[PDB]
């Protein structure tokens, strides 16, 4: 019996995105009006606009929060070919201050902070088919150093860090490929950090994702011996990735992978545009051209099913 309560946003232009902070006490919204707004949740469960500023002169494609250990930090990326880092400089005098602009050749299609145990790192991807990884050398001085350039050889549309804090797994990034490519398949690529070469190397290519990829999400690993990846294309796909075996005598490779499609769902009825896991990785949300958000969950027999569908008027489908 989910209940939705409308608020009068009164946005100058429609906001193309909303992002919660890590604690779900704050949200950021962004719009065609060239602004970002920040909203704080009162004790009475009401939202109040606490900051509003003009951010750019280009289509803000993505917004992301840093981990709260680095303070109140936002990153945004744009059609203007830049990513920007913002810090909430409060006195009640909040005024999200631009700390840097990353300027290294085409639209920056996605931006994601790395898992906190890797430090204050930011990945960007661009339609030039490059992923760039920056590091802030001082968390108190939000200067950024370009650490890595990863040539994907396909237009990058989206990126996901593997959130696994296990020291048994090298840092991993999934990347997509929007290119319609009548033929080229492999539109999801996986990169692994190689300690011996101090470089990201291509570990995997999901050859079954011959369709254009719109979004990708690694599931929270929560002690599994295998990774789970959701992929948004013309359908919703779920992959399990099992790392292969090993010998302590010597090792310098990407440790090849066994990949299985465990689910494929065409029930979207339109090019599924977004996929998002809940905080436990037990429920998937998807959105598509059918004007619905769908909720997916496995039962105790690992059988995934839909568990909810919505309407244009805002009512949940009976």
């Amino acid at each position: 019996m989910f209940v939705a309560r409308s608020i009068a946003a009164d946005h100058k232009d429609l906001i193309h995105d909303v992002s919660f902070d890590f604690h779900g006490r704050r949200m950021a919204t962004c719009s065609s009006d060239q602004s970002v707004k920040v909203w704080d949740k009162s004790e009475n469960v009401n939202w109040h606009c606490t900051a509003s500023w003009k951010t750019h002169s280009g289509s803000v494609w993505r917004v992301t929060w840093a981990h709260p250990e680095f303070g109140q930090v936002l990153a945004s990326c744009s059609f203007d070919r830049t990513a920007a880092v913002w810090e909430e400089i409060v006195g009640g005098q909040s005024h999200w201050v631009k700390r840097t602009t990353l300027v290294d050749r085409t639209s920056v299609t996605d931006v994601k902070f790395a898992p906190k145990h890797m430090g204050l790192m930011l990945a960007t991807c661009s339609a030039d088919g490059v992923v760039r990884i920056y590091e802030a050398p001082d968390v108190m001085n939000l200067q950024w150093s370009l650490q890595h350039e990863i040539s994907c050889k396909l237009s990058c549309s989206c990126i996901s860090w593997n959130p696994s804090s296990s020291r048994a797994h090298s840092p991993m990034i999934a990347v997509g490929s929007d290119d319609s490519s009548p033929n080229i398949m492999g539109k999801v690529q996986i990169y692994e950090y190689n300690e011996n070469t101090r470089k990201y190397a291509k570990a995997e290519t999901l050859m079954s994702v011959s369709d254009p990829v719109h979004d990708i999400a690694f599931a929270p690993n929560l002690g599994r011996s295998f990774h789970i990846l959701a992929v948004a294309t013309k359908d919703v796909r779920i992959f399990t990735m099992k790392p292969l075996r090993k010998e302590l005598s010597s090792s310098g490779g990407v440790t090849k992978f066994e990949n299985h499609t465990v689910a494929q769902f065409d029930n979207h009825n339109s090019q599924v545009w977004r996929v998002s896991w809940n905080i436990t990785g037990t429920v998937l949300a998807s959105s598509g051209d059918d004007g619905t958000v769908r909720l997916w969950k496995a039962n105790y027999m690992d059988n995934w099913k839909c568990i909810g569908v919505l309407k244009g008027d805002g009512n949940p489908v009976g």
């Binding site: 050749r105 890797m118 204050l120």
Partner: protein
């Protein structure tokens, strides 16, 4: 022991034994007094960084002693990194700070690096490619890096066509008439020879054909720009 041998030393035996056992500060000081320009310190530190990156446990235990014998001006800001990152940070520092008018610099470093195996750690490269936008192409085609050499050349041509010129220290593309444009013809001819000496190699032939097609596009646009410059310079001997 060398206590006794310091009892009869000299202005460079010292420098060497000390650059030997860590102490990468005491010696930058002894040198800057007796003015004797020091590339042995940077080569030796680069060697220790390489040995650590391929080093065993025992090497990590010994490394904390020479790392502590320096500060590291200021340490840290987040996730830790087993030395590794430690000596590479003393790098950025002992470089940018103690730096020279000529070349105790990029060159000596890139060299000891391609010398013992290394996809170059991207900082150095990015910084010797808008300050000295070529000669490295040479360090590359010498240290048998044919693949990466063809890459650098392509990148430079791309810059020259107005695309990404800021990442190549280039001021102009088809603008402000014609000024200077150094074309690395000898390195391109070595690439053509090396691609022709591999023959069977299909991958090298695919790269060579891609490079040739791109060079032809460049020479056609260069011919047009030169013909338009000739028309521009002919207006005016009518003042």
């Amino acid at each position: 022991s060398t206590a006794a041998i310091a009892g009869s030393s000299a202005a460079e035996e010292m420098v060497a034994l000390l650059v030997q056992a860590g102490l990468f500060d005491t010696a930058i000081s002894l040198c800057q007094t007796f003015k004797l320009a020091l590339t042995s310190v940077f080569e030796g530190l680069a060697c220790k960084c390489i040995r650590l990156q391929q080093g065993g446990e025992a090497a990590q235990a010994e490394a904390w002693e020479w790392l502590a014998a320096n500060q590291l001006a200021t340490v840290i800001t987040t996730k830790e990194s087993s030395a590794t990152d430690e000596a590479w940070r003393l790098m950025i520092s002992y470089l940018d700070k103690y730096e020279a008018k000529n070349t105790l610099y990029h060159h000596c470093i890139i060299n000891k690096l391609l010398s013992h195996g290394v996809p170059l750690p991207n900082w150095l490269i990015n910084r010797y490619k808008a300050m000295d936008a070529a000669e490295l192409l040479r360090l590359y085609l010498k240290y048998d890096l044919l693949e990466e050499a063809a890459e650098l050349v392509l990148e430079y041509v791309d810059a020259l066509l107005g695309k990404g010129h800021q990442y190549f220290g280039i001021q102009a593309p088809l603008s402000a008439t014609s000024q200077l444009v150094w074309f690395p013809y000898s390195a391109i001819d070595h690439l053509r020879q090396a691609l022709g000496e591999n023959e069977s190699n299909q991958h090298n032939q695919a790269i060579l054909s891609k490079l040739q097609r791109k060079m032809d596009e460049y020479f056609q646009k260069l011919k047009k720009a030169t013909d338009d410059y000739k028309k521009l310079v002919q207006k005016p001997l009518r003042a």
